[PDB]
Amino acid sequence: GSSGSSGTARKCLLEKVEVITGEEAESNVLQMQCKLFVFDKTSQSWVERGRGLLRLNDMASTDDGTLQSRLVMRTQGSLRLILNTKLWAQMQIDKASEKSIHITAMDTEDQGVKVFLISASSKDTGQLYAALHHRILALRSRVESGPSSG
């Protein structure tokens, strides 16, 4: 084989990812057209943030190396991204209605945690929801060991 050293006298391997393409090769659980709304204390109500397509993409964890998840929402116009946050075990999500849902996420610019809403058909709404929950149940199952059998 070959042998050569330079500057940094420490490396992981030749086939480094830094050079390798994002190769995101992420997974698409479920995709459906939905709308996003945020509560602006200013108006004290739901304000139009961005309406378009919504889907749950599965990503790999870094410190956990496990199947991580996040909340993405692309608009209908230029599929622009306005909502991007990584779900967490202590994630807040409750089913307000069979069509609307209350989930907490962080913005991309404001990077602040706010109460987001999800409006969709009585069916679609249940789909996306049935997903989120799990996304968290998988995390809470790691932090805690669980019930120890006597």
CATH code: domain of residue 98? 2.30.29.30
For 76, residues 6+ apart whose C-beta sits below 8 A from its C-beta are: 33, 51, 52, 53
Dihedral sign computed on CA atoms, order 22, 56, 85, 139:
negative
The answer to whether residue 85 is domain-embedded is yes
- Which residue carries 């050569």 as its tokens? 4
Our count of domains for the chain comes to: 1
Task: Report in angstroms the alpha-carbon separations of 18 from 23, 45, 67, 132.
Answer: 11, 45, 21, 31
Is residue 84 within 8 Å of residue 75, measured between CB atoms? Answer: no
Strand 113-119's sheet: what is its strand order? 81-86, 67-75, 45-60, 27-40, 113-119, 100-106, 93-94
